[PDB]
Amino acid sequence: ALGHTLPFYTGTKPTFPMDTTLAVIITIFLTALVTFIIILPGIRGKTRLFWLLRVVTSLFIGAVILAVNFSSEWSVGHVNANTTYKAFSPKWVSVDVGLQIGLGGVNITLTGTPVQQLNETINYNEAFAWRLGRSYAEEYAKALEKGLPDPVLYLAEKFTPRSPCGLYNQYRLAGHYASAMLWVAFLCWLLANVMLSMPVLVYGGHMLLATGLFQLLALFFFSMTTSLISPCPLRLGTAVLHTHHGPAFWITLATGLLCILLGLVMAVAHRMQ
Amino acid sequence: ALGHTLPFYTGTKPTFPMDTTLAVIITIFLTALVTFIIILPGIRGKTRLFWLLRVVTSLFIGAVILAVNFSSEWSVGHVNANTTYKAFSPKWVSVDVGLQIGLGGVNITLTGTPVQQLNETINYNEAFAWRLGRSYAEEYAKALEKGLPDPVLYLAEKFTPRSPCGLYNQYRLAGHYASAMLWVAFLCWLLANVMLSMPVLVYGGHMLLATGLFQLLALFFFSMTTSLISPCPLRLGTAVLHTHHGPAFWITLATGLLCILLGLVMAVAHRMQ
Amino acid sequence: NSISWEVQRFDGWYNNLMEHRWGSKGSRLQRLVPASYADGVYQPLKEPYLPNPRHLSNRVMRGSAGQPSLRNRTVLGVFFGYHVLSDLVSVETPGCPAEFLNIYIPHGDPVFDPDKRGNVVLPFQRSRWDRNTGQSPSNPRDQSNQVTGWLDGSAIYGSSHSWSDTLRSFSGGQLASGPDPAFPSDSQSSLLMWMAPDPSTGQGGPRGVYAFGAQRGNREPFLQALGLLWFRYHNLCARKLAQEHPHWGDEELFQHARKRVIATYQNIAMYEWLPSFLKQTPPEYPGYRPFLDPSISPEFVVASEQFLSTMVPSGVYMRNASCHFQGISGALRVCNSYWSREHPKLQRAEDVDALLLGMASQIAEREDHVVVEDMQDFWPGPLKFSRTDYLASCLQRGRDLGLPSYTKAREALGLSPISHWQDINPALSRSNGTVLEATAALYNQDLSRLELLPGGLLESHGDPGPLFSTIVLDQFVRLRDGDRYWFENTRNGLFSKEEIAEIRNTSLRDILVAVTNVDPSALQPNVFFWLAGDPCPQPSQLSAKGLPACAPLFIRDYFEGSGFGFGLTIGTLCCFPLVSLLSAWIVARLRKRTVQQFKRFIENYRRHIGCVAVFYTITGALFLERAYYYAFAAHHSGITDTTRVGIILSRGTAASISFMFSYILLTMCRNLITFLRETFLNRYIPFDAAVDFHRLIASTAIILTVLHSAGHVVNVYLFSISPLSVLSCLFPGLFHDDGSEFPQKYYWWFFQTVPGLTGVLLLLALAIMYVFASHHFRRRSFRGFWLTHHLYIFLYILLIIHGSFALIQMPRFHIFFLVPAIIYVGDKLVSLSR
Amino acid sequence: NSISWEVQRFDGWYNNLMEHRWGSKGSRLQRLVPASYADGV
Ligand SMILES: *[C@@H]1O[C@H](CO)[C@@H](O[C@@H]2O[C@H](CO)[C@@H](O[C@@H]3O[C@H](CO[C@H]4O[C@H](CO[C@H]5O[C@H](CO)[C@@H](O)[C@H](O)[C@@H]5O[C@H]5O[C@H](CO)[C@@H](O)[C@H](O)[C@@H]5O)[C@@H](O)[C@H](O[C@H]5O[C@H](CO)[C@@H](O)[C@H](O)[C@@H]5O[C@H]5O[C@H](CO)[C@@H](O)[C@H](O)[C@@H]5O)[C@@H]4O)[C@@H](O)[C@H](O[C@H]4O[C@H](CO)[C@@H](O)[C@H](O)[C@@H]4O[C@H]4O[C@H](CO)[C@@H](O)[C@H](O)[C@@H]4O[C@H]4O[C@H](CO)[C@@H](O)[C@H](O)[C@@H]4O)[C@@H]3O)[C@H](O)[C@H]2NC(C)=O)[C@H](O)[C@H]1NC(C)=O
Ligand SMILES: *[C@@H]1O[C@H](CO)[C@@H](O[C@@H]2O[C@H](CO)[C@@H](O[C@@H]3O[C@H](CO[C@H]4O[C@H](CO[C@H]5O[C@H](CO)[C@@H](O)[C@H](O)[C@@H]5O[C@H]5O[C@H](CO)[C@@H](O)[C@H](O)[C@@H]5O)[C@@H](O)[C@H](O[C@H]5O[C@H](CO)[C@@H](O)[C@H](O)[C@@H]5O[C@H]5O[C@H](CO)[C@@H](O)[C@H](O)[C@@H]5O)[C@@H]4O)[C@@H](O)[C@H](O[C@H]4O[C@H](CO)[C@@H](O)[C@H](O)[C@@H]4O[C@H]4O[C@H](CO)[C@@H](O)[C@H](O)[C@@H]4O[C@H]4O[C@H](CO)[C@@H](O)[C@H](O)[C@@H]4O)[C@@H]3O)[C@H](O)[C@H]2NC(C)=O)[C@H](O)[C@H]1NC(C)=O
Ligand code: HEC
Ligand code: HEC
Ligand SMILES: CCCCCCCCCCCC(=O)OC[C@H](COP(=O)(O)OCC[N+](C)(C)C)OC(=O)CCCCCCCCCCC
Ligand SMILES: CCCCCCCCCCCC(=O)OC[C@H](COP(=O)([O-])O)OC(=O)CCCCCCCCCCC
Ligand SMILES: *[C@@H]1O[C@H](CO)[C@@H](O)[C@H](O)[C@H]1NC(C)=O
Ligand SMILES: *[C@@H]1O[C@H](CO)[C@@H](O)[C@H](O)[C@H]1NC(C)=O
Ligand SMILES: *[C@@H]1O[C@H](CO)[C@@H](O)[C@H](O)[C@H]1NC(C)=O
Ligand SMILES: *[C@@H]1O[C@H](CO)[C@@H](O)[C@H](O)[C@H]1NC(C)=O
Ligand SMILES: *[C@@H]1O[C@H](CO)[C@@H](O)[C@H](O)[C@H]1NC(C)=O
Ligand SMILES: *[C@@H]1O[C@H](CO)[C@@H](O)[C@H](O)[C@H]1NC(C)=O
Ligand SMILES: *[C@@H]1O[C@H](CO)[C@@H](O)[C@H](O)[C@H]1NC(C)=O
């Protein structure tokens, strides 16, 4: 290269735009789709559509079951408020606070309405996890030592163990069992694709029903939390924060009903003709 | 049971007498020996000794190669001195300080000559590891926060990164490559036992030589440290601490020469008759 | 908006620029003298070395109750001091693992051992400590403070933001109220307040337990009156701001009233109560010292809080607004009022006003070693007894905190040395002289062993004494000068110069007149003293004569009525085979209508012996690994203090049957077996005996599940007689330690838990699957055997659910189950095409 | 022997009973005014 200054590479270091564990899934399934599109011209002209649909929907269902698990948009909330920012400063900022409660943690986003307000850049996105292998209390203590802005710590301690609003145990158990149901549904999807390749129509059409029923069971498990965060106040200055059902909830509902419909259609079409 | 007091089980909680990763090895190989002794009466009377020796020595060599790796008695030292004990106390204790330098760490032992001197129990045995997956500096900082006795911290910081006596890099590299050679020797022992079961005399007699040569190579790698800890002072009050070659060194030497002798005997006895 | 300053945090963080953690909640208590433990770390001094607590409380701290104070201090001052100390320090929450430092009642104590027996142990649990301090001698154990060490009104608003949120109504800038706007709301009942039972009646509900900022603010009606005062005062300040600034929101009103209330509280607690407690005016404010360490010392817990008990009276008056005492005798007995729920005399607002006025015009007890019986005999007990000894449990807490001796603390603080016993208190030695002799006899004339609390009480004549005054004054000076948000620190922007003067000229009578709408001529200017001219004198000094007697002692039994149902449940679980056997019986009935021979055996079955030996050594290795961990390597979690043999026997067999039940399918992988039948493996493994091996692994894995179920039948019994403060340490997230100590019943563990309820179904499935798959019934009806033997699907489903809900450890069965299930289902799919 | 006091450590640890790390080597520099950086950090 060329070394004539110090440092040698004088430039701003970049940051990844989106979530990594979602871009991985999108790229993997786009790669598989491209491979099958490449193979496509090597199949008979009649069954081209019958293969295209059968592979596209199978891949889409398998990708949704896996992306919804690691998603953090099951219950989401959002509000625009004026809050305090940091310690040793009487200055207030105008931000867009948000909550994103997943199955094994919560992501809190503080973002200024102008991103540059106090000669700073307010674009936070913080994650506190309560999975079975993690400890929420140690993560909150570490995020309190390193001094995050004030509203981030407020919303982060609302979910802490042994708080006057008992959200920790409920969200932890519900997320644990919803994640387990989703893993079982993924296993059933794998077995459905296997027992559909070799000619077994009944068993494939019966594993699709299981792939759907376990997604609906995950919905049932996670919906036992909405009756708990409703009374607990999430006031941030002059604004209240209300959480409702996010996109991952309705996505799981839609693909569950789709799998159930496909299973029933296969069973019926196997019985009569 | 019976609950009539608080706590229910009022008794001293025990401690394991010896090292765990050595008792595991001893019990495993004693179990294998007992199994083969049980099978022994089911073999012809002539080949009983030929099987007994061939299985006992093979097992003993395989156990030594594995126990010497996790041992911490490659270079050892010992002295009896009067030293300070703790902070905020002008009192001195009479102890038996010792060093035990292994391949991936060091064990330091402070033990009073009477174990009970200052209304305390002085029977320490502390381990600081410099393996590739560990950090000596963080372990030393954590052992300095939690306040261990004064001589333990002295000997523990002699091996710390960036000390006026450069022991860290030398001991780290030498231990790393000696451990690698010992793993290769263990693999060669496995292959020797495999290629001896099925009838291959030449290749078995030639893998025994490798099993010996890699042990001797481990000795060569670790012996590049003795010329470094000799000038660095280990004074503890009125006593000096000198380290020499421990039992693991001579054990590896003995089994290496044994494997080499067996390999040569097999090769010679395969050539002439 | 209108908030032109930096609002103060609730948990005390970021108050100091350099040390962010100073004063925060859950922070260490920083001691003045190095810790004096038995081994140097974490182990208390005990009864062979130091005298017996209950035997020491009877020889020095015992006497009558009609002793007036020397300075004419009033009861309102005593309980205002209790309120302030609830703001500063709280060290009474037991910590994990559960450790006990019990109190052995001497044989014949007329209170705790009337029917003379031998062992009448009173339980006592050590408090919470810091997890970085208990291991080595140059860093002994340090306990942690449950509230914020700053004098920041952390007893009115709470020590966290989420706590303060449950106290606000979010309308008008006020704290939440109930049906009566003069009392807080007792709605939150799960994780807010301390639900300790009433010792005199046993009531333990959350109805009548008001919500304050201090977790234990309902301990007495007299400590409740101060909390009600400071609740009504906030709701009164936030209601005058809304009258001056009608355009302010709710957060502005709250943060403007909170600031004024904290400043008024600081002014009173520092410049009106302290000059009365110590009889020494503190030095004037020099300015904010960013480098002074304001931490709370463990000796301050004894100098301030445990000393106030020498002044608590036996009864408390009630007064009109104009000198009428018959409850607005009419005094409240203090022993019958602990953790009172709904007092029939304190249900209106005028009644609490009458209590505050009567406390204001009543002189407290003399400051000396004597303590009234309502505290050393009838203190509300936290474990198993409902009554305890406050002094004997204050001596046991000094030993637990590792506090110095009396002559050793008197030296580190720079006080003159003391040689004889008649020098602790010359006036006491001249008048009585029979208390110092008894103390000497108890300590064997070893003055260097006299501990902090008995020494500071014998040294006190009319005031706290030389040693206690020093600790208290130094602590308060360091709390004032080290706090950034002190209302006099003009560089924080809270108040202007005129507001600071208007606050510095406010007293407690001004607050009692604001809240209680009485004429200011009904109280005295300084309500911490009652002098010869003040209004509404006492009727007479209130001794323990005419008052009702204290409610007697009763022992709590957790396993009281659970004897019959426990036997029925165990008998039913043991009768599961005897009902499946009857079902199989009727099903069948309706379906009908020398040494040379030894070595020969060895050489025949060499392969069988080898395979069985390998299998059983693997199961033994798993059992021994778990038994090792729970016998030698799990002491940081005190689970072997409750169940030792039970948990080892039940967690070893768990790891062994997780392997026996997983690898039992490799004996029925038929296609894999028939493929490996002709291979070099045939020289080592006899594949002809693959079903006989099925019945061996199966009939040896039930002998371990019986041990598992029996071990957990023993555990569930010991879990249903242990206190709630122990279970809260064992199983967090399943139990929470509030005041009411009572565990869950036995049937809660069996039929209302995931493991307990799946375990019974597993036992039933096995009891059917094993009895029907028996050589006596398999030979007589193959269809019944074939139908019942398909319960293994249900079995593995239940086994995956059973291990979830990680109670003792994280699940591991799926790790054991992945590989054999995959091999089995693959072999099953292969055997489907053919 | 003849050393009748507590010899002083070389790295400054355990000089204070309460704050063991005060004055030690490699410890923070504690400022008098909040840090004035370009972005605050
Ligand atoms: C949910 O959530 C989650 C969570 O978040 C997620 O996840 C995620 O995601 C993402 C993707 O997208 C990511 O993350 C990210 O990342 C990034 C990167 O990273 C990297 O880098 C970094 C940086 O560093 C630098 O800097 C610093 C300071 O800061 C320093 O110190 C250093 O040294 C460096 O420096 C350098 O560079 C620079 C440039 O840049 C220059 O200038 C200089 O000179 C130098 O040279 C780093 O740090 C990192 O590292 C880390 O990590 C690792 C791994 O982990 C480790 O290993 C290491 O060690 C480290 O660590 C540490 O720390 C931690 C904490 O952090 C701890 O824990 C540990 O222990 C240690 O201590 C790497 O390397 C980054 O960047 C980011 O961050 C951001 O964000 C966050 C949140 O949001 C926060 O917290 C932070 O703080 C930040 O923020 C900030 O910034 C921004 C910009 O960027 C802004 O906007 C904001 O606002 C803020 O601001 C503030 O501050 C600043 C300063 O700081 C200022 O300026 C302003 O004004 C204001 O004040 C993040 O982190 C990943 O991938 C993931 N993961 C994780 C774990 O993260 C998810 O996705 C979600 N989900 C959904 C669905 O959404
Ligand atoms: C080399 O080297 C190495 C190293 O060492 C080795 O290895 C090893 O080995 C061995 C075998 O033999 C072992 O070790 C051992 O172990 C044992 C056991 O452990 C267990 O336990 C424990 C205990 O605990 C208890 O205690 C405490 C106090 O201390 C408390 O805190 C707790 O809580 C508990 O308590 C309880 O109990 C008691 C009774 O006991 C009662 O009383 C009460 O009440 C209650 O109840 C524990 O701790 C543990 O745990 C731990 O660990 C785990 C695992 O790791 C974890 O997880 C947890 O968490 C924990 O941890 C913690 O800590 C740590 C540190 O330690 C850190 O790291 C973390 O982070 C956390 O924080 C278990 O469970 C033990 O015991 C031992 O120890 C001992 O030793 C050592 C050394 O030596 C030291 O350091 C220590 O300190 C100790 O010492 C002491 O003691 C002794 C007796 O025992 C004595 O003798 C001495 O002298 C000393 O003394 C001192 O101190 C004391 C107090 O402390 C006093 O008293 C006196 O006076 C003085 O002062 C050990 O550790 C194992 O196995 C292994 N490994 C390891 C890692 O370790 C090897 O072997 C070598 N090699 C060769 C070749 O040789
Ligand atoms: C953990 C589950 C499990 C237990 C416990 C168990 N078995 Fe079985 N058993 C199986 C499975 C799985 C099969 C295979 C059934 C099949 O796929 O045909 C099987 C098959 C059998 C067969 C069928 C052999 C054949 O002709 O194919 C017999 C006989 C048998 N088991 C006897 C027993 C006996 C006797 C016991 C204990 C008393 C027992 N089993 C306990 C799981 C179990
Ligand atoms: C068929 C076997 C079986 C029976 C019967 C059984 N268990 Fe278990 N149990 C297990 C296994 C296996 C585990 C461990 C699961 C794991 O580690 O993933 C376990 C674990 C447990 C655990 C600990 C779970 C955890 O969170 O770690 C409890 C509690 C328990 N069993 C209670 C019971 C009770 C109560 C009964 C009936 C009285 C019972 N079990 C009967 C097999 C059984
Ligand atoms: C590949 C060919 C064979 C390989 C075998 C050797 C591999 C290394 C072994 C590591 C094991 C280990 O380390 O165990 C660690 C654990 C406990 O850990 P700890 O002491 O807390 O950790 C610190 C580790 N120290 C001490 C080295 C620092 O001890 C145990 O479980 C003991 C349980 C007994 C196991 C029973 C097996 C007996 C045979 C069955 C008889 C019927
Ligand atoms: C630590 C404990 C020490 C143990 C020492 C003594 C062990 C005693 C074992 C006794 C062996 C024996 O007597 O044989 C009885 C049965 C008979 O089999 P068969 O040939 O009569 O059908 O044979 C069996 O029971 C079979 C067991 C081994 C069969 C292995 C088959 C592998 C199956 C397929 C796996 C994929
Ligand atoms: C923040 O302050 C501005 C300034 O008046 C105001 O217009 C805006 O409404 C405030 N935000 C909220 C959420 O009230
Ligand atoms: C901060 O930003 C303001 C407005 O953009 C500007 O006037 C000021 O100089 C900035 N301060 C620093 C330290 O850059
Ligand atoms: C320790 O002190 C004793 C007391 O005189 C002495 O005899 C002994 O030699 C001393 N130890 C050493 C190693 O010098
Ligand atoms: C310490 O031990 C000495 C001698 O054994 C004894 O005299 C002293 O009382 C002990 N101290 C404590 C606190 O047990
Ligand atoms: C004092 O009590 C009497 C009767 O108990 C009552 O009539 C009178 O109103 C009371 N005084 C005040 C000021 O309330
Ligand atoms: C307090 O304020 C009042 C009101 O004017 C004043 O009369 C008095 O002198 C001030 N100081 C006191 C009461 O000590
Ligand atoms: C203290 O109160 C009594 C009556 O309770 C009174 O006689 C005495 O004068 C008071 N003390 C002083 C110093 O006035």
Short mmCIF file of C-alpha atoms in Angstrom, two decimals, chain C residues 180-300:
data_model
loop_
_atom_site.label_atom_id
_atom_site.label_comp_id
_atom_site.label_asym_id
_atom_site.label_seq_id
_atom_site.Cartn_x
_atom_site.Cartn_y
_atom_site.Cartn_z
CA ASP C 180 -59.56 8.07 51.90
CA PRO C 181 -57.26 10.78 50.46
CA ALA C 182 -55.36 10.81 53.77
CA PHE C 183 -53.93 7.27 53.50
CA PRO C 184 -51.81 5.55 50.85
CA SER C 185 -53.08 2.67 48.72
CA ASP C 186 -52.41 -0.94 49.72
CA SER C 187 -53.19 -2.27 46.24
CA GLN C 188 -49.75 -3.59 45.29
CA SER C 189 -49.26 -6.67 47.42
CA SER C 190 -46.75 -9.01 45.76
CA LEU C 191 -43.26 -7.47 45.59
CA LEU C 192 -43.55 -4.08 47.31
CA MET C 193 -43.99 -4.27 51.08
CA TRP C 194 -43.08 -6.60 53.93
CA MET C 195 -46.03 -8.89 54.64
CA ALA C 196 -45.02 -10.03 58.11
CA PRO C 197 -47.85 -11.49 60.22
CA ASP C 198 -49.39 -9.80 63.22
CA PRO C 199 -47.91 -11.55 66.28
CA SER C 200 -50.93 -10.95 68.51
CA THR C 201 -53.57 -12.37 66.12
CA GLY C 202 -51.78 -14.16 63.27
CA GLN C 203 -53.35 -12.04 60.53
CA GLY C 204 -51.12 -11.92 57.48
CA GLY C 205 -53.06 -10.52 54.57
CA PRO C 206 -52.05 -7.54 52.45
CA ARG C 207 -55.20 -5.60 53.41
CA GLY C 208 -54.15 -2.62 55.50
CA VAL C 209 -50.46 -2.71 54.58
CA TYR C 210 -49.95 0.78 53.18
CA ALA C 211 -47.39 1.45 50.47
CA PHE C 212 -44.45 3.61 51.55
CA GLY C 213 -40.91 4.10 50.31
CA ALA C 214 -39.50 1.93 53.09
CA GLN C 215 -40.18 -1.79 52.77
CA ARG C 216 -40.81 -2.14 56.52
CA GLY C 217 -42.76 1.03 57.23
CA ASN C 218 -45.73 -0.77 58.79
CA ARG C 219 -43.72 -2.20 61.69
CA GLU C 220 -45.60 -0.09 64.25
CA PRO C 221 -48.43 2.46 64.17
CA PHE C 222 -45.96 4.99 65.58
CA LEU C 223 -43.56 4.53 62.68
CA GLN C 224 -46.57 4.52 60.36
CA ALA C 225 -47.64 7.94 61.63
CA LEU C 226 -44.42 9.50 60.35
CA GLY C 227 -44.82 7.90 56.94
CA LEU C 228 -48.39 9.18 56.78
CA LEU C 229 -47.14 12.63 57.75
CA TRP C 230 -44.60 12.72 54.93
CA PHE C 231 -47.13 11.29 52.47
CA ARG C 232 -49.74 13.93 53.29
CA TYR C 233 -47.09 16.66 53.14
CA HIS C 234 -46.08 15.77 49.59
CA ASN C 235 -49.73 15.64 48.52
CA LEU C 236 -50.09 19.06 50.16
CA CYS C 237 -47.09 20.67 48.44
CA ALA C 238 -47.96 19.30 45.00
CA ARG C 239 -51.43 20.79 45.50
CA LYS C 240 -50.23 24.35 46.14
CA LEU C 241 -47.99 24.37 43.08
CA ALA C 242 -50.95 23.38 40.90
CA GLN C 243 -52.68 26.47 42.31
CA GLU C 244 -49.83 28.84 41.37
CA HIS C 245 -48.77 27.27 38.04
CA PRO C 246 -52.02 26.00 36.49
CA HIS C 247 -50.21 25.17 33.23
CA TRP C 248 -47.69 22.67 34.64
CA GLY C 249 -47.98 19.00 33.80
CA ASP C 250 -47.78 16.08 36.19
CA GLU C 251 -44.05 15.39 36.03
CA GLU C 252 -43.28 19.05 36.68
CA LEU C 253 -45.53 19.15 39.74
CA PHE C 254 -44.09 15.92 41.13
CA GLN C 255 -40.46 16.88 40.55
CA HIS C 256 -41.04 20.31 42.08
CA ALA C 257 -42.79 19.00 45.18
CA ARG C 258 -40.30 16.17 45.66
CA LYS C 259 -37.43 18.67 45.68
CA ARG C 260 -39.05 20.81 48.39
CA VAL C 261 -39.99 17.79 50.50
CA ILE C 262 -36.47 16.33 50.37
CA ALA C 263 -34.97 19.70 51.32
CA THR C 264 -37.34 20.16 54.26
CA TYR C 265 -36.64 16.61 55.40
CA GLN C 266 -32.88 17.21 55.28
CA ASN C 267 -33.19 20.48 57.19
CA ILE C 268 -35.17 18.87 60.00
CA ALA C 269 -33.21 15.62 60.21
CA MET C 270 -29.91 17.51 60.39
CA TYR C 271 -30.52 20.73 62.33
CA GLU C 272 -33.38 19.81 64.64
CA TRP C 273 -33.21 16.08 65.42
CA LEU C 274 -29.44 15.64 65.58
CA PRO C 275 -28.93 18.56 68.03
CA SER C 276 -31.48 16.84 70.30
CA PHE C 277 -30.18 13.28 70.01
CA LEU C 278 -26.56 14.21 70.74
CA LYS C 279 -27.04 17.53 72.57
CA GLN C 280 -24.31 18.85 70.25
CA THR C 281 -24.94 21.30 67.42
CA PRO C 282 -23.16 20.15 64.25
CA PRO C 283 -20.68 22.53 62.60
CA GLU C 284 -22.01 24.84 59.92
CA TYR C 285 -21.94 23.91 56.25
CA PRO C 286 -18.46 24.49 54.77
CA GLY C 287 -19.32 23.57 51.19
CA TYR C 288 -19.53 20.51 48.99
CA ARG C 289 -16.49 18.25 49.47
CA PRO C 290 -16.30 15.98 46.39
CA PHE C 291 -13.65 13.81 48.09
CA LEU C 292 -15.29 13.01 51.43
CA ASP C 293 -16.39 9.38 51.58
CA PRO C 294 -20.03 9.32 52.79
CA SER C 295 -20.41 5.55 53.19
CA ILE C 296 -22.30 4.02 56.10
CA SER C 297 -20.32 2.06 58.62
CA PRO C 298 -21.57 -1.06 60.45
CA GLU C 299 -20.81 0.63 63.77
CA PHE C 300 -23.32 3.34 62.85
#
